[PDB]
Amino acid sequence: DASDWLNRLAEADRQNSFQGTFVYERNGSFSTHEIWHRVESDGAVRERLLQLDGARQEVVRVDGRTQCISGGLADQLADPSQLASWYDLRLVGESRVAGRPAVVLAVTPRDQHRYGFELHLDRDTGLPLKSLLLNEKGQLLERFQFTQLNTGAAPAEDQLQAGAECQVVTVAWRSEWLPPGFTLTRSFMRRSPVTPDPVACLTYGDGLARFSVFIEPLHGAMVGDARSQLGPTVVVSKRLQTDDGGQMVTVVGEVPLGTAERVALSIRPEAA
Template sequence: MRLKVLCSSVAIWAALTGGVFAAQDVSVEQWLQRLQEAQSTQSYQGAFVYERKGTFSTHEMTRFSSSTGQLTEHFLQLNGPAHEVVRTNGQVTCISAAIADKVNSIEVWPTHNIALDPLHQWYDVIVLGETRTAGRTTAVLLFSPNDQHRYPVELYLDQATAVPLRSLLLNERGQLLERFQFVQFQPLPADSEQKRGNTASINCLPVNTQQELTDPEWAATAMGRADLNVSWVPPGFVLQRSNYRPSVDNDGYVLSQVYSDGLAHFSVFYEKIHNLEIEGGRHQFGPTAVISRRVMHDRVPLMITVVGEIPLGSAERIALSMQSDQESKDD
């Protein structure tokens, strides 16, 4: 699969850029180290296009990295509803009312927080060449997976700052599933946050971040369960964080767990249900797999849902690894 993905990706890249491969003076390891540093230190502003399944949206983004290590990101949707989001150190701190009830169940905006340590174990990373994005010279890095549980990714890193100015999520045949691409980009000086001040408008409503789940005993109290876990995840994916929130559809609660391999990620949601006639489902929305399955866990009816930009078969296997009471007895 790796050779097929690599050949397909190189062909796509050559078609998009004219096939001009510049001499590479920077190694993969150096680019990855620069990328990691840029994630925590680089401030910038710009506008980007987000495309999935033939649908486009445009967004304005400003990112501040302070001298104290605080990272603040402000997003404003420019077409359609004026959705607004502010994230501080990865946590959503304010959001437009129209999407506030979805903040804990969706990935609010594309993010490129990449953990470098495990990547080489699960991906082959190569430098394809150079091109231009948003009027700036970019180096093209291909992350080609070593198994069938994750998708290939191309990152286009700004030559000057190592900020990702474009990312392409591909399927196993090298076909485009999702595109994130800056059309305007401007690096900002380190003290720009103090000069500019708070960027959020009055329509951006504060979000209570105190529901973050860090105490297992508190989690058990909140959910009435202490053992909500899937028994299988793809190799290399580890639990990053958990949180709990009131359910939108009933008076119960939803526990969510986010897993990542350093580049890709998926979420598992557990929700107590009252209507036993509700069935699960199997859907593919562009690059996003959504698998829902009803289980009886310790005599409690639950809906388990796996959501992520991973292959559908992998998401289904994760959901099926949550055993029901009858399956546990059969074992």
């Protein structure tokens, strides 16, 4: 049963120490990374991630906490129980990934507003071996795949220590429309990268997909639509007519183009 395999996935990261190498690929980027993952005797997870190609990007985490992170990952830093309501969870067979037997789960959207996944889960541990993000037509948007996974034996302490590049470290807006299952994760204010203006940020998620909304004042300027794509991440900007000079609404996230567009056109100011 797929529900059971996803619950096992949810807990696998606290019940297994491991080390491994994986690749991440999208249109325009291919990279290899290494991970060392140690579960301490009290259950805390200590994890180090290192990029193996090109620059030495790195992060070390202790449970949720970022202990250190390299600058190129940080310059813009300011639960599967309900998933079956928005995705059909299906065991579709068996596979072999990184020389290990796996089960294949198809996580298929129940509507047009989110992407699906093909997940390959390690039989021995429930850890993820392969994650493929698929669009509506079944085409591949991103590939996450281990090439080797070494489980059981815990990484040695020296393997959990990062290098020198790892640096020790109310908004008056709402959406009138969200796809089912998406909820507000967080809202906060930032500043425009260009001007003195405050920019409101809202972030949303359904447990699998996330998107962010940015609302920036136009001061009466005539600025039109924009759109962009970076692998699975769409960017849409649409002007919002307002009584305070207009706003540009930007939606960024791992959702179909039409979802980002519909969200962007549904943003509204809060009323008294």
